[PDB]
Symmetry: D2
């Protein structure tokens, strides 16, 4: 399976913050936003990950991640020239995907808890498509699964999170789409095709899971508050790519220490040292 | 008086966040970090403001602020090629300053409360230099005024915040400095010259003032939590440059509404509309 | 003017917390809830204060407050045997009030900001009734002033003339409590209900749900950590009002050293 | 095994809050403090539980808890007349314990995470003494296990054999309280003090200062808002343990509808 992170978009619901910075480069406590979906793909066992970015934000991502070799992954880059929709991921990413299955994760999504770590590797064998469900108070704000049926932006309270697994048929499914009334090629339309053909699996996320989207002022700040709370109260750092790479055997002890040393002043590197001790 | 915002630096204490984004473009709840020192200079009555940035982060600042005309100010840009210290502001900014006095504000500083709004215009008449003092629990982390005496990074608990006003002599004072042991031209050395010559005024900030530096994970997140608390509990938005420009008469009603309309999706523009209603 | 704090009720929206403790003895960061409305009256210049409690919660209040001498005030107590409504304040407190005007504050309300401190003394010479207004997103949840049933909710602070006792014994129950709404209207039907909007930047909080209680505690701690302010500290207000001296404040501080509250009193004597 | 909760003490580090209320009746978001240690014992399989309170705070506890029938347990009470130390638990509770092993939990402690739920039943067949370890940045502030006086602090959860009564009546005061430290050592001098480190990812909280209380409340609400978990809800544990039925849980829910706590119980019956 190949991985793609959608890390473009305009981020209008964060203006004026996102007039100066990609949403995916915003801090969520102790790390950039893009670390969270990155580590989700890593935990699923995916090493060849393509980032889709805007042309203007790309240099920041390169500065942060480079080719991913320090995290034991192969990060590549594609450019999305206009924010024309999520389903463009499969068109832009077609050459990256090749003949393989694909995992798409949205750049503003955080997945934490039971069933959202290394157990996600079970999806590499996907045939058809596989998406998820999570209860929310304001479903009209989300894509909604009825339990059967899907609808963008009301009749189930289950939002569909931004993590999707597909077989190789997704590329041609995406290529056939037209822009919606709001001028975007829509992931819900991709999901509908699978649903209509009896080839869409859905699972509700496990009890005790946190799913977050950081695209509003309050949701960004709630996310950062959560991550800190985990550290201060449970002693846990979450979505640390160096640690994930280390535990998967993609980087060794010496590489981990070289990372720690570079990150000593903020405190982040001290965590990496503790992993060894 | 002319204004300069120090908006470069490496931001090492925020790594790996600041490997991807300038510290000055980070969110503090509902706006970018750079809005806070920007509005401090605006409230002091300063319209000609030069931003000093790194070469690599400059495009983000341009995208966000442009030439400042939409906020009724003249924003200009200078490039600092290496993060060689705060006191370089006066060398880099010498042509901007010309014959005038100058206000320097640090890009990571937030000033809120009594005495930190439009009353700051009293400093435009500065002769000599003028700095401030604020009680902190861990003074060894800061520049410290003894009450008399100054020291970078212990014997008063009063930190010197990142807001400085100088007469035109500062340029030549700065040009004469050498790099410290840590490889930076030091603002505390500028302040020392004024102090030694009997030309440094110091005021403790007023009771009820908040001074924040956002350069660690915890201080960034504490700042954002504070700003939201002000809104949710007291109904106050703070450091909104459009509002400051409007109240000073640098933008009119029509310009304010044009700003509001551009910022409708995040909620920020709704505040600007309410100002009119 | 005399003062009354409604410190009874059931507190049902905080069950099961308030099956063990009065809402008005709950902590809001560094002090009990009752300290907030108490300091509001104190800052309005009021020194003779009656607290209305339930029978079963009264001993807690006595242990915390005693007769108030230590805060330079006269705290009296009255019992409300059933939680039959807010307007019963003026029946229960009728003798406490006597000939004077009265200030009523609700036990679960926090008032903070411009015009909610020592400026409140101006309401002492009130004739008729004065209440307040605070813009809210959901006026249907509150009492609403324009009329009385706008986005303007009526907070739990009220100033009245001596007439108020009469009106209150007058009232009957509701669809059931003796309602403060009905008092205010009866004043408005005489056209002597004055309203003021709370100033820009004020915080008005009600601590009667899990989230509102916790939001309030967070707010108070934020004020300390970020602006170095401790708020509604009655010892401090007493000492600023001239009601207790430098030395009385020192003795308060010694009793409170272990929590850190006492250290803040010591700093007042720089 | 039998259980004891130390729910007395003065709570000096929370003055003036705890001049009006016991520390153990303070709210931690959506429930009283006492619910947390109570549910810890309940999850250890313990159903006969004695709460030790001060004389003056006891009525609050009775109103909240009664005899525990409604939570499928047997809650008894004992009075501690002066706050003379934690080891007095085993003197006061000596008859409650009788022939059995005992679980002691501190009233102001919250235990949350892996190995602090129904796994705790394994300590019922304890021989000797078992205590726990939690890494802290400032071990000087705590009791410290390696020996006993490392960065490993001893939380307020303890499992002992029937011997514990003997040792406890044995002890004398300290420089002054009857100390739990001294009990544990006396077991260690026999080499039968077992220690386990709390698992990665556990939260151990003590709510005895302004900041720690408020940090704990924030933590509990964060778990609900972000992971949809309500924690240490005794009704839920009773119903999962088989100690009360679908219908008993419904009746609990009706008494608690206004606060929202009751709605969570209804959702358990999906
Ligand atoms: C629309 C679009 C979004 N994205 C990213 C941004 C988010 O991480 C994710 C989901 O989109 P959204 O969360 O909608 O992000 P957005 O950039 O569209 O923001 P807003 O709607 O507030 O204007 O996909 C792209 O990479 N390309 C795109 O064309
Ligand atoms: C050192 C330096 C800082 N700055 C800015 C960044 C901050 O807003 C402000 C004060 O500096 P600091 O707060 O020290 O910021 P920094 O970038 O040096 O971060 P760190 O010390 O953690 O590595 O000045 C410059 O513009 N140019 C510089 O050469
Ligand atoms: C109804 C009533 C309230 N009060 C107090 C409690 C509050 O501080 C204030 C306003 O009442 P409420 O905020 O409504 O408090 P409550 O005790 O009625 O709780 P709930 O409504 O959640 O069941 O007045 C009394 O003293 N006596 C009473 O009869
Ligand atoms: C000392 C003592 C404490 N306790 C309870 C209170 C706590 O839940 C627990 C541990 O005690 P502490 O946490 O020390 O609580 P405290 O009441 O002694 O408060 P402070 O030390 O701030 O004055 O034991 C008793 O029941 N009886 C006692 O004699
Ligand atoms: C292994 C690991 C997991 N996690 C996170 C991912 C998940 O949100 C959560 C649980 O991970 P894991 O224990 O792998 O869960 P599961 O086996 O149920 O998939 O912990 C990290 O943040 N860092 C790590 O190094
Ligand atoms: C006028 C104004 C002030 N402020 C802030 C700046 C200060 O932190 C605080 C007080 O401002 P101000 O009332 O101007 O204070 P002072 O006259 O004492 O200088 O409010 C804004 O955030 N936005 C505004 O539009
Ligand atoms: C004097 C004082 C005021 N305050 C609070 C009361 C108000 O909420 C806020 C402003 O008080 P104050 O300065 O007395 O305001 P005003 O003159 O506008 O009435 O500060 C305290 O909390 N403690 C104090 O000792
Ligand atoms: C079963 C249950 C557990 N918990 C808590 C107790 C623990 O802190 C955490 C884990 O409980 P549990 O799943 O019983 O863990 P273990 O088998 O590791 O002992 O969840 C509740 O809060 N409520 C409940 O109903
Ligand atoms: Mg979008
Ligand atoms: Mg999104
Ligand atoms: Mg620096
Ligand atoms: Mg700084
Ligand atoms: Mg009520
Ligand atoms: Mg109320
Ligand atoms: Mg103690
Ligand atoms: Mg304790």
């Amino acid at each position: 399976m190949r991985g793609i992170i959608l890390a473009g978009g305009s981020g209008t619901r964060l203006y004026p913050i996102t007039m100066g910075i990609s949403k995916q480069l915003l801090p969520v406590y102790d790390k950039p936003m893009i670390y969270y979906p990155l580590t989700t793909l890593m935990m699923a066992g995916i090493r060849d990950i393509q980032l889709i970015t805007t042309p203007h934000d790309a240099p920041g991502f390169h500065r942060l991640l480079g080719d991913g070799a320090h995290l034991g992954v192969n990060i590549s880059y594609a450019t999305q020239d206009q924010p024309d929709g999520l389903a463009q991921a499969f068109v832009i990413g077609a050459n990256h995907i090749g003949a393989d299955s694909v995992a798409l994760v949205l750049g503003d999504n955080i997945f934490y808890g039971p069933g959202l770590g290394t157990s996600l590797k079970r999806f590499q064998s996907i045939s058809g498509g596989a998406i998820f469900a999570y209860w929310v108070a304001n479903p009209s704000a989300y894509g909604v699964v009825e339990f059967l049926s899907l609808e963008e932006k009301p009749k189930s309270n289950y939002a569909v999170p931004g993590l999707y697994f597909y077989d190789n048929d997704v590329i041609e499914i995406a290529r056939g789409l037209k822009k919606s009334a709001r001028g975007e090629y829509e992931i819900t339309e991709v999901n509908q095709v699978y649903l209509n053909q009896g080839r869409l699996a859905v699972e509700v996320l496990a009890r005790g899971t946190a799913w977050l989207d950081t695209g509003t002022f309050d949701s960004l700040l709630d996310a950062a508050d959560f991550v800190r709370t985990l550290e201060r109260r449970q002693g846990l750092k979450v979505s640390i790519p160096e640690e994930v790479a280390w535990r998967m055997g993609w980087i060794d002890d010496e590489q981990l220490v070289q990372r720690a040393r570079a990150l000593v002043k903020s405190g982040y590197g001290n965590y990496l040292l503790e992993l060894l001790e």
